[PDB]
Symmetry: C3
Amino acid sequence: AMGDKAKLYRNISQRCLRRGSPEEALRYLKEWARHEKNDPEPLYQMGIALANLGDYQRAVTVFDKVLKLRPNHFMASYRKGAVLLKIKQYKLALPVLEAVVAAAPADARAYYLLGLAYDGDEQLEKGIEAMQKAVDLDPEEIKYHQHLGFMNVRKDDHKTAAEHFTKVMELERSQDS
Amino acid sequence: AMGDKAKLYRNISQRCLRRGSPEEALRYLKEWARHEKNDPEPLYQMGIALANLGDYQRAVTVFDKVLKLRPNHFMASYRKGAVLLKIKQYKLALPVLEAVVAAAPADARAYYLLGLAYDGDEQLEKGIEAMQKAVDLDPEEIKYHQHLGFMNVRKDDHKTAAEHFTKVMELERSQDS
Amino acid sequence: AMGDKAKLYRNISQRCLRRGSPEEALRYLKEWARHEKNDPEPLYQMGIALANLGDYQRAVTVFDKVLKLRPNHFMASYRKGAVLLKIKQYKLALPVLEAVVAAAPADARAYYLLGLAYDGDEQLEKGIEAMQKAVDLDPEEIKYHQHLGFMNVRKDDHKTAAEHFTKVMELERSQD
């Protein structure tokens, strides 16, 4: 069912993304899209490309095109959530991320993103609940203790912040190779 | 007779350009120019410097100074044409590039620049004619097959585009091995 | 007197600065400052951080906070001078730099900075006097001969400029 033109442009696209030049890959993803119109994958890959180039708003638009074709596209949502967050559109990220966590409830990174989102929207206790899940799902990861630390700082509870940070340090030390 | 100050500042200039710091070289090229006023070489090198810094509009200006002193300065034209094209001033780039091709008709890169200029000015068939010359003059070069491809895409002739791209791929493969 | 929270955030701060990520270190310097309020060192480190990030105007402000607590803080002034100069506020840099040179009169770099400052404020002869000090205090440094050269160029004395630059070249050659 996949045409020869699509196979070709998908191939060249992949090369460009592997040699790390998104801007070129885009031109060939457009072509793959042209020839398998209604296939979400090329659109999805555009989305990834546009996000790496920092053209965030247009990545959100492309991810929406992918979600129109597959409303439960797990990764499209994850990625869209991630960019909505990088752009500081927290209120719009929350429902998306909360959907991701519902599909992949053992995925620390997701709960971390969710926590950052809640924190941006000034729902601090919900950010802490999320980020704590991320810590519990992956306790080795410094990033998560660190944010829990700063989240406690903003709560004006400096006692707990320090507990989180003393652990940040214990971790940085034992990862000295 | 060149004169000792010129020899000196030329020397230092060269060092700076070789160690890859244009911004410093400029200061010395100015001086070489001060002392061999009417010699086009320093000006020419300024132009190259400015272009590498991305100060394009000022490079064009300096290349014009060089062409006022040597109206057939082959390289000054080539470089001016190249920057006119980077800045998207296509109409002005065409006569210049068309002059370079006339002086160096076996030079694929010139024809490629010319093709990109025509394509920017929405003269598509003329861009294909140029880019095809470039391909014919240097068939190993992926870049030229690739633009031919995309130029056919804009013509809405996807059959030929794919023929050019299948060759893009055959080339990318045999340059891994 | 230095307490456990400070020791901790100072520690983490240092790590961040060593692994070369200023933006993170800042967050922790803030915390060290919160807990040893009135200690100038965290503030001074903020200053350095901000200047590395290119947030120059806010570095000047923090260095000022450090100078309010220690008016002769030698390094605070040096760094503040250096950033005032990078930002092209020459008239304000001169008194600061002239203070640094008073405190560290064998420091070429300080005189070089001073000379650049004078030059920016169109006091060219004073710039040459400073830069010359820098060259005399550190004759191996190309940078200083170079600026002397260009300072003479602006004076329209091309004979001397060339003498400085022939030396710039002699030095670039013997250093490959």
